[PDB]
Amino acid sequence: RGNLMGKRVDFSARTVISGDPNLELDQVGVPKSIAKTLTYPEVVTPYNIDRLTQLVRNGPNEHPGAKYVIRDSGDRIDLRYSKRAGDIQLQYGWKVERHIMDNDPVLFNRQPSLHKMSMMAHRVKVIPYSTFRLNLSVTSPYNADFDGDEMNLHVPQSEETRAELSQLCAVPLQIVSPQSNKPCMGIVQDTLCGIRKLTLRDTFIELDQVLNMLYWVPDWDGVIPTPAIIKPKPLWSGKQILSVAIPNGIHLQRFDEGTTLLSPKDNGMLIIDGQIIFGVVEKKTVGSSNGGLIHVVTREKGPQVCAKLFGNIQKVVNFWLLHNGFSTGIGDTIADGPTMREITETIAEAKKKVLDVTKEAQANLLTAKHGMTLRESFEDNVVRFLNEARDKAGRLAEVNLKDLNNVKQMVMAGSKGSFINIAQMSACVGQQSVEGKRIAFGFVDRTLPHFSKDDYSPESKGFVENSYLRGLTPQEFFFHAMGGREGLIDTAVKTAETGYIQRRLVKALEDIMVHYDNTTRNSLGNVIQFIYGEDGMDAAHIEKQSLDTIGGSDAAFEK
Amino acid sequence: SNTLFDDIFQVSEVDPGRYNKVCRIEAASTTQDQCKLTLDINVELFPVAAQDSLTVTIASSLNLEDTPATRSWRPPQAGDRSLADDYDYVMYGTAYKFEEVSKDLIAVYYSFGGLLMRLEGNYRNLNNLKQENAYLLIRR
Amino acid sequence: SEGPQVKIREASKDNVDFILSNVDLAMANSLRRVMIAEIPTLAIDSVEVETNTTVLADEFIAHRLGLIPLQSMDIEQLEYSRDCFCEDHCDKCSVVLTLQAFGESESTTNVYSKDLVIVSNLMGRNIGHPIIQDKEGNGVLICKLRKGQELKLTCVAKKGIAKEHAKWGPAAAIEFEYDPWNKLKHTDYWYEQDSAKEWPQSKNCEYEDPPNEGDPFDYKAQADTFYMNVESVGSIPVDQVVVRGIDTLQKKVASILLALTQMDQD
Amino acid sequence: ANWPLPVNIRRIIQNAQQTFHIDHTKPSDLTIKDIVLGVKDLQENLLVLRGKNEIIQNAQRDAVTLFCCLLRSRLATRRVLQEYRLTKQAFDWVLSNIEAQFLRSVVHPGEMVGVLAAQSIGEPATQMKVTSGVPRLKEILNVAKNMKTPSLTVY
Amino acid sequence: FDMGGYFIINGSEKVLIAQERSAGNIVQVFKKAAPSPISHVAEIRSALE
Amino acid sequence: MNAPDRFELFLLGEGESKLKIDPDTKAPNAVVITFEKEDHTLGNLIRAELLNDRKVLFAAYKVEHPFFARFKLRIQTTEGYDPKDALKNACNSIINKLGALKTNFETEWNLQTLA
Amino acid sequence: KEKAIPKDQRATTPYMTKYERARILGTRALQISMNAPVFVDLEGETDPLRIAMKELAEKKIPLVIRRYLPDGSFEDWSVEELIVDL
Amino acid sequence: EGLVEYIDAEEEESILIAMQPEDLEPAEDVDPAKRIRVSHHATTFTHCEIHPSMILGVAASIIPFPDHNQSPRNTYQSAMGKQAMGVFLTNYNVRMDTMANILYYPQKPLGTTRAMEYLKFRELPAGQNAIVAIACYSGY
Amino acid sequence: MIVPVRCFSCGKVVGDKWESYLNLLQEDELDEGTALSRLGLKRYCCRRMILTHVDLIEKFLRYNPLEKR
Amino acid sequence: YDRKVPSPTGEYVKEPEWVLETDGVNLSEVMTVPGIDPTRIYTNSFIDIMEVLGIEAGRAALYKEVYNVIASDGSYVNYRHMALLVDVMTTQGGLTSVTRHGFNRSNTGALM
Amino acid sequence: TLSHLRRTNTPIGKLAKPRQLHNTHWGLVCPAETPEGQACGLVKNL
Amino acid sequence: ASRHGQKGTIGITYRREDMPFTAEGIVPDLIINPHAIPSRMTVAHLIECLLSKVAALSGNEGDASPFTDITVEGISKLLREHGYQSRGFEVMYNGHTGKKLMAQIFFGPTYYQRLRHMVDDKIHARARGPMQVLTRQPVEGRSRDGGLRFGEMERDCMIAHGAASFLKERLMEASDAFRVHICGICGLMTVIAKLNHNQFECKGCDNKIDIYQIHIPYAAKLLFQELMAMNITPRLYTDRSRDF
Ligand SMILES: [Mg+2]
Ligand SMILES: [Zn+2]
Ligand SMILES: [Zn+2]
Ligand SMILES: [Zn+2]
């Protein structure tokens, strides 16, 4: 396992990764110092004699340069210590081990590397500074961020593996994963938040910014679209500019709840011939979702066009968001006075319900739910009352949030956060649970030495009535910490156990392959399936479709 | 080129919704009782209030004499004459749906960069509205 | 003359507050960008350490010495060492300052920038002297010594721009604002109940009339009448910061014009 | 009724309508015989297996049963003439694309589908009344004689 | 500002980390799982300081 | 260490020219000028001045990567009007405007007293 | 030779697979780098991989693919007769 | 003098403790911004907390407003605060350590904690007060 | 360790105000906010430069010199 | 529970039915108790399903359990990936485990 | 240095959940300071 | 990192004239993404910035101890008394163009810490270099010019890609590659090869004309020899004796 199944290899590099909005999806930024250490042995031909000669003359201390010369006899010449006799005369069939240049295909990997999209092939882009640089849309397949993560680079050494790498493992070929027959990459973060803001109906752009936005799309045909508003002032809508990045001939239609041809809430999606008709562009369109824009483009026009779609959308949206701006502060977590009063009484009503059930239970008039003990039924009622109280309070807080609220904006775009985050920050953190139960009596008949024995009120067993904005009380702080410790322990243990499960699964199925007779067989030749998947298709080409004959009434079927 | 549809409407109501610059207005024709209009208007550039009368025109081109991404848009130059000179609010968009509402009622859906319009009317007055690009001209 | 207009509201040796009217926003932004990053200035660039028995490191002291503002009034009579015909440095492209401090007293002795001594031939110029801008006459507190500690070093000052290193910047914060009443709607004011009550009014609101409270949005208006406040570190007079920023910007456009002409011949 | 299947027919019809500019008002030139025979012979070209014996032919027919059901439901005589308004040129274009799309969706021989399946099952496991999640997965892979919470569902 | 509390062994500062153990001379009663003939057990780890 | 020398921002290198003018094939009478060792300071100013010319149909600039101090300028003029001449006219307009601004500031400054 | 299936009863796909295309391009690219005679006209190209792609597009790669079966038998398919549709 | 008392976990089982003397000890409008504090309305208290903040350790006593954070974030900071460069000792110029990192200009936080007064974080701070903007500026 | 020469954010010289700042605090009995404004530090970027500075060089100067002349 | 059964008109409508859920498994005996629908009885433990109904029934049960675990957290995996795993676990006539006592006891070469 | 001088360790056959933050830990060990790795809950801080 | 679990690396650096600025001319020393806030619910990070802003404006030390009477509304009132928006928002301008940003930026002081992890102490690449004495594979450690591990999980991913030739090159030409001579009678690596004299012999088999050379990883050679030490005979053969 340590020396044969895996081993340390030559011609590799490791460093911290950074995010570059100005790199293509399949490009990787390589530090210049690394590019000077890593080399590719290129064979001398009539097509490269002059270029290789200049690289040899440059020497090993100037990129683009070279480090070694290998003759047809197998002798290797270090270009250091070799200038004494002058520049060497190259001959056909020789090899020049030269610095990895731009557009060289390289394998780019992040460990643990739990699936094949964690090793993908990128095109080299030699750059200043000491970090690797990659497009933001390829961070989800790698499960990578820029808090300090490091990634590994591997350089192929032959034309065989060099074409193999770029024709099988290239990033554009991995956009649609076969794990869940849906795209594994999509627009994320800033570009997901900006695209939602840019495609609102109120978003209008003037000539000067439109011209710059048009010029930022590399494949723009030089034709200025007619503004949506002609008089009294030429104004372009954000949908019109974002449509320039969408390749022509792409059609996409989606209906959300309440969506009609006249979309009163601007929800849903309607794209005809690459032009957005209505609908806000958010995660349901430009995300890694089934039937979205990326899925349609990569299947209709191909993977290379889809890769250009990633860059074009990112460039146009990033420019627009750079000059519009987007922030978030303490003011985005504050609900108005009336909302807090409604929230306070909502929690009070829930607490009164808890008091009502506790007092009837203490009177022995409560009947246990079928198949449950009296205490378990009582706890189930209390947790349900308190859980619904938090959700209702969060709903009250969320409804009060204005459309200009930045946290609300992020949630609507699908970029970050969710309803629960808003509820806990603004309305109520809620019930803390350890082992799927309320805080247990660590002390004799109480949770802390601050209550009285045999206390079952929500405040005693770990119900945080406050929000993060208002601050947890010392009892709530400790109970909240107890719940947090549960998550940290679960993260560690599950990480170790799932890792062993993954290895066991891989080793059990590693020798199974689809053969030229369409059968699925193992190394023994034993038939596992007589046709792969029982249909013979590849999951990367499967899409969800409706069978129109099975459903509906008989009369509709006849009609 | 030539007008595909001209008519006068009385704005029944205006709805701002969640927007600060765009209002969806409901209007009905002054001469025909079967013609109604739903239109999204940038009211920051062309305010509209209820009880207002609007002259709505649809044309296939803005150049005066008949001439029936087409061509790169350029800023208007001094001495440029077009249909827009006679109106206050002008928009350019595409027709993306034709829906049969009744035996003789036909509805045409337009999109001006995301500002949606719906023109319902009898079959014999919206017969020149094709599935193409068109200009929408509004004069108070 | 009937171009950009200027009105000075408050003038000082460290700050100049003026209104820039009848100008484009692109021109105004370029003026402040050039004033921050491209006005040549004299600063200490290389330090030779002969003795250092202080509690600070040589690199620590060198960085401090490079941040001391030197006089740059006659900086244009100096040359760029990269453009000069000399081995390392000479009197045509550099100024040499020496710093000699010893801990002769029992109390802590402070080394200031007034202790820097010019040992070059200034050739009648007005550059090199550290800027003294306090009451007691001292400068920047360079270092502190106890009894028996010595600091002996030689500083070489060269001209540069803040693009190369922020130490060559002659300007501190530059205030820059337009349309204090938000009549062009370039900002969408975040608020909770009422944005007018929640956002304090700019002091420049008194120089412009408020919105007429019910008039239609003016879509033909463009940004002009910029309110600018330029601060100076003291290396050059603040008025010279504005004047030389215009000079630097004017030269840059001329260089583009000259380069275009040079291509025409070939 | 919503199930993963190889070829997206709705997109193909939409492309045909937008490519040939179907009038939607003038009647088409298609014939009922052309539609029925066009779909029938298209079903023969949906080839996953290419053996020329009875056993392989039966397997080939079984492999495309569900797809042919979807094919026949979408490309019905009434639906083609009334819902889609397809022209003869558009109809032939649709048939060719479905054949091309289907032949491209077939699994490529030499694909290591075993490692692919293992990684596709194990990767979701890393982000994970009855036992659920990793403990239940771990209980299934290791065929545990005594499981934590055995249960019966009786109808 | 140095606080001590450590040792210098071979020039290296070494801190002794407090070790957590269970108290002795206390009776503790535990329940045992089903597959065992013993249902309950009272245990005391007698210790003399 | 891979930090580029800071003088690479403004000092033009060997074999590298300030301007690089290449025709644009995506549209007629259009050209793309690549400015070396320049940043948003000149790009924004030049592009804004070009947009005030009535014989200019398109004007835009972009800095493709913030690592390198170069920006591209795309200009398209009306038929019969050379884009290079449009750049010449815009540059002259900026120079004359800046000259007027300098005189106006100096004459206004000489009227103050505190400094 | 019982393991060589005659051309008239080959039951494998008439389409090139992605792995077959990858190795053929890499195989021919390596040969081009070693000064192999190019059978396609070059309008200006120095990368061996691009030259191989031009040859594959014009069906000028003189190689055959020996597809193996799980019982040891094989089928010979010319690169020229294999459909490149993926 | 019998004003404070050492109490261990076992004796803690037989005592009633008040979180604060402000509200719990006195026999018994409200600011809507203040957190909701539970009185517990008990008249048999035997002890009182010196201050609730002392439940935290050395690393968690540097966090500002740890009760306005999610608990895992407090845990992360406790671990990360030990990886920050500062001034570990004032005699670093006479010690020969394998490795040492010294910040050029250590600053003391503008937002500090009262527990930090006893950790000497104002005398030997690890960090600086940077002017921070929360924005999506360039996508970097 | 010693007072920074310039403000990090805007570059205003603040290294010539430390002794003035201390003297205002000690002899004039001024509050630190009033002293900061009396020194001409208006932007809060400059105020925190002088307000949060820890003078460690005074601690380092308590050790006897390694090498006396 | 709610089950969608075809309506007499021909449409699918959800009608409620009473279902008995149990702690503990006696599949063989319970399957014979009168009143139940023995063609629908299901067991959480697929081992009992394999012992009573056969390998093919256990194959379907094993897939159902694996599918439930994956989908319990809301994630979706394509059918073929799970189908291949279950087929490998049942290809030898019984339930072979993914441990060292199962697949690792086959005849596949010592080096593998 | 201060944190390292106030750390405690617990050697993990035992039947209990020692990694959890018990109620009796109140005011005696920090509820927040613990390693994120395999020492989570086993290394405590006073 | 800040004091709230928010850690990050520098993506890029900008000069002052490129940064966003306020009307007072203050530029940020540091810009963090808004997306770091919501999911993590570090409300203390934003309260600290608001408190520190007031602390710098008034010349005081903000009290940030956990359980006190200090509320956000109280800090907001103090901030507005100083002529600033109560919630910490300011109107900023784009540094490239000078135009106002349509949104307002939460802007103020925050205490950040420089962590121990610097990239210049992590970046390292290896074309070729020293090998270990035992396995003759790249050595471990950046400080010793070592290589990177192409582990089993990486091998699985490359198997899933179908890149057979790349997998071989990584394991052979990027790592230990060794040539040995095996006997055709016995599959043992016991052939004494005098490559200078072009002579081969496998004593014990008494043959000199049935030799083959194979390319295997040096670890594989090490493995087989270790098995030989354990009395096991792994006999490598170049032809098949049984049909598939
Ligand atoms: Mg990370
Ligand atoms: Zn000189
Ligand atoms: Zn400042
Ligand atoms: Zn032998």
Copy the structure tokens of residue K37: 């790795």
Residue of A233, A21, A35 lying closest to A139 (CA atoms):
A21
**Residue given tokens 């006195």 in the structure block:** H26
What residues of chain I lie within 8 A of the CB of H96, using their CB? none
Question: How far are the Cα atoms of A330, H77, L44, L80, L87 from residue L49, in angstroms, in the given order?
Answer: 9, 17, 9, 15, 10
Tell if the CB–CB gap between A553 and J9 is shorter than 8 Å: yes
Bridge pairing between strands B133-139 and A7-9: unpaired
User: Cβ distance A10 to L174 under 8 Å?
Assistant: yes
Distance (Å) from the C-alpha of residue L19 to the closest C-alpha of chain A?
Answer: 11
Amino acid C218 reads: D
Residue of H3, H51, H42 lying closest to H24 (CA atoms):
H42
| Residues of the domain holding A267 | 183-324
Q: CA F53, CA F56: separation in Å to the nearest integer?
A: 6
User: Cβ distance A482 to K31 under 8 Å?
Assistant: yes
Ligand whose nearest atom lies closest to the CA of A145: 1
Ligand whose nearest atom lies closest to the CA of C91: 2
Dihedral angle sign, alpha carbons of residues A160, A162, A163, A167: positive
Å from CA of L233 to ligand 4 middle: 12
Torsion, Cα I55 I56 I59 I63, to 10 degrees, reads: -130
For residue J11, what are the contacts with CB-CB under 8 A and spacing of at least 6? A551, A552, A553, A554
Q: Exposed, middle or buried, D51 (CB in 10 Å: 0-12/13-18/19+)?
A: middle
User: Cβ distance A165 to L165 under 8 Å?
Assistant: no
Other beta carbons less than 10 A from residue E33's beta carbon = 8
What spatial distance separates the first Cα and last Cα of chain K, rounded to whole Å? 14
For residue A231, what are the contacts with CB-CB under 8 A and spacing of at least 6? B84, B87, B88, B89, B90
Dihedral angle sign, alpha carbons of residues K14, K16, K19, K24: negative
Q: CA A120, CA A105: separation in Å to the nearest integer?
A: 10
Question: How far are the Cα atoms of B135, B139, G50 from residue B47, in angstroms, in the given order?
Answer: 19, 12, 60
For residue A311, what are the contacts with CB-CB under 8 A and spacing of at least 6? A24, A25, A135, A218
Copy the structure tokens of residue I44: 């809060």
Subunits that touch chain K (at least 3 Cβ pairs < 8 angstroms)? A, E, H
- Binding-face residues of C in 46-85 toward F, CB within 8 A: 82
Copy the structure tokens of residue I18: 């430390």
Amino acid H55 reads: I
User: Cβ distance A156 to L166 under 8 Å?
Assistant: yes
Other beta carbons less than 10 A from residue A488's beta carbon = 21
Residue A138 DSSP class: G
Other beta carbons less than 10 A from residue H100's beta carbon = 12
Torsion, Cα A174 A144 A161 A77, to 10 degrees, reads: 160
Q: CA C5, CA C228: separation in Å to the nearest integer?
A: 13
Q: What is the radius of gyration, based on Cα positions, of chain F?
A: 18
Q: CA D137, CA J85: separation in Å to the nearest integer?
A: 13
Copy the structure tokens of residue A44: 């001398």
- Across the beta sheet with A76-78, what order do the strands follow? A39-43, A95-99, A66-70, A76-78
Do C79 and C142 lie in one domain? The reply is yes
Do C50 and C162 lie in one domain? The reply is yes
What residues of chain A lie within 8 A of the CB of F67, using their CB? 127-129
Beta strand residue intervals within G26-73, DSSP E:
64-68
Q: CA D2, CA A545: separation in Å to the nearest integer?
A: 5
Torsion, Cα E34 E35 E40 E42, to 10 degrees, reads: -140
Distance (Å) from the C-alpha of residue K13 to the closest C-alpha of chain H?
Answer: 25
For chain F, the domains span 1-115
Q: What is the radius of gyration, based on Cα positions, of chain J?
A: 18
**Residue given tokens 């071989």 in the structure block:** L168
Helix ranges (DSSP H) in G34-74: 48-57
Copy the structure tokens of residue L22: 């306020």
Copy the structure tokens of residue C7: 């009105």
> Rounded to the nearest 5 degrees, what angle is found at the Cα of D24, between the Cα atoms of D21 and D25?
125
User: Cβ distance H102 to H84 under 8 Å?
Assistant: no
User: Cβ distance A294 to A543 under 8 Å?
Assistant: no
Q: CA A272, CA I54: separation in Å to the nearest integer?
A: 64
Q: CA E14, CA E16: separation in Å to the nearest integer?
A: 7
Q: CA J52, CA J66: separation in Å to the nearest integer?
A: 20
For chain I, the domains span 1-69
CA L168 vs. chain centroid, Å, equals 24
B74 and chain F in contact, CB less than 8 A = yes
The b/e string for B30-64 (b: 16+ C-beta within 10 A; e otherwise) is eeeeebbbbbbbbbbbbebeeeeebbbbbbbbbee
Other beta carbons less than 10 A from residue K15's beta carbon = 8
What spatial distance separates the first Cα and last Cα of chain H, rounded to whole Å? 62
Tell if the CB–CB gap between K30 and H75 is shorter than 8 Å: no
Residue of B49, B52, B54 lying closest to B119 (CA atoms):
B54
Residue L93 DSSP class: E
Q: Could you give phi then psi for residue B116, rounded to 5 degrees?
A: -90, 140
Distance (Å) from the C-alpha of residue F107 to the closest C-alpha of chain B?
Answer: 38
Q: How many CB pairs under 8 A join C and H?
A: 3
Question: How far are the Cα atoms of A323, C198, E27, H42 from residue A328, in angstroms, in the given order?
Answer: 16, 17, 57, 43
The b/e string for F60-97 (b: 16+ C-beta within 10 A; e otherwise) is bbbbeebbebbbbbbbbbeeebebbebbbbbbebbbeb
Mark whether K and B touch (3+ CB pairs within 8 Å): no
What spatial distance separates the first Cα and last Cα of chain A, rounded to whole Å? 65
Q: How many CA atoms lie within 13 A of F74 on its CB side?
A: 23
Subunits that touch chain A (at least 3 Cβ pairs < 8 angstroms)? B, C, D, F, G, H, J, K, L
Amino acid K22 reads: H
Dihedral angle sign, alpha carbons of residues A195, A200, A205, A210: positive
**Residue given tokens 């043959």 in the structure block:** L207
**Residue given tokens 């954010």 in the structure block:** I9
| Residues of the domain holding C9 | 1-40+167-266
User: Cβ distance I15 to L39 under 8 Å?
Assistant: no
**Residue given tokens 């004069």 in the structure block:** B139
Other beta carbons less than 10 A from residue A365's beta carbon = 8
Domain count, chain C: 2
User: Cβ distance A236 to A204 under 8 Å?
Assistant: yes
> Facing residues of A235 across strands?
A229
Do C145 and C184 lie in one domain? The reply is no
To which H or E segment does residue A95 belong?
Answer: strand A95-99
To which H or E segment does residue A383 belong?
Answer: helix A374-400
Dihedral angle sign, alpha carbons of residues A122, A124, A127, A132: positive
Three-class SS state of J75: coil
Torsion, Cα B14 B15 B19 B20, to 10 degrees, reads: 40
Residue I13 DSSP class: B
**Residue given tokens 């020899």 in the structure block:** L225
Distance (Å) from the C-alpha of residue H40 to the closest C-alpha of chain L?
Answer: 18
Dihedral angle sign, alpha carbons of residues B28, B29, B35, B38: negative
Resolution of the model in angstroms: 2.9
What residues of chain L lie within 8 A of the CB of C163, using their CB? 15
Do C109 and C145 lie in one domain? The reply is yes
Give the one of L12, L96, L120 whose C-beta lies nearest to F40's C-beta: L96
User: Cβ distance A417 to A328 under 8 Å?
Assistant: no
Q: Exposed, middle or buried, K35 (CB in 10 Å: 0-12/13-18/19+)?
A: middle
Helix ranges (DSSP H) in chain F: 40-50, 83-109
Q: Could you give phi then psi for residue A411, rounded to 5 degrees?
A: -65, -45
Search chain H and give the residue with CA nearest A458: H38
Give the one of G21, G46, G75 whose C-beta lies nearest to A48's C-beta: G46
- Binding-face residues of A in 210-269 toward B, CB within 8 A: 221-240, 261-266
What spatial distance separates the first Cα and last Cα of chain C, rounded to whole Å? 36
**A145 assigned ligand-binding residue:** yes
Three-class SS state of H46: coil
> Facing residues of A357 across strands?
none
Do C47 and C133 lie in one domain? The reply is yes
Q: CA F11, CA F9: separation in Å to the nearest integer?
A: 6
Residue among F45, F67, F73 with most chain A CBs within 10 A, to mutate: F67
CATH number assigned to the domain comprising residue A239: 1.10.274.100
Residue of G3, D104, J59, G16 lying closest to A529 (CA atoms):
J59
Helix ranges (DSSP H) in D28-112: 32-45, 54-63, 65-74, 77-78, 88-105
Q: CA H104, CA I3: separation in Å to the nearest integer?
A: 10
Ligand whose nearest atom lies closest to the CA of I9: 3
> Rounded to the nearest 5 degrees, what angle is found at the Cα of L122, between the Cα atoms of L119 and L127?
125
